[PDB]
Amino acid sequence: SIQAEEWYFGKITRRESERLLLNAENPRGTFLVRESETTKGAYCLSVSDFDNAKGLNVKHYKIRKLDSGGFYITSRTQFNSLQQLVAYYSKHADGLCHRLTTVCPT
Ligand SMILES: COC(=O)c1cc(C[C@H](NC(C)=O)C(=O)N[C@H]2CCCCN(Cc3ccc(-c4ccccc4)cc3)C2=O)ccc1C(F)(C(=O)O)C(=O)O
Question: Which atom of ligand 1 is nearest to the CA of 14?
Answer without folding.
Answer: 47
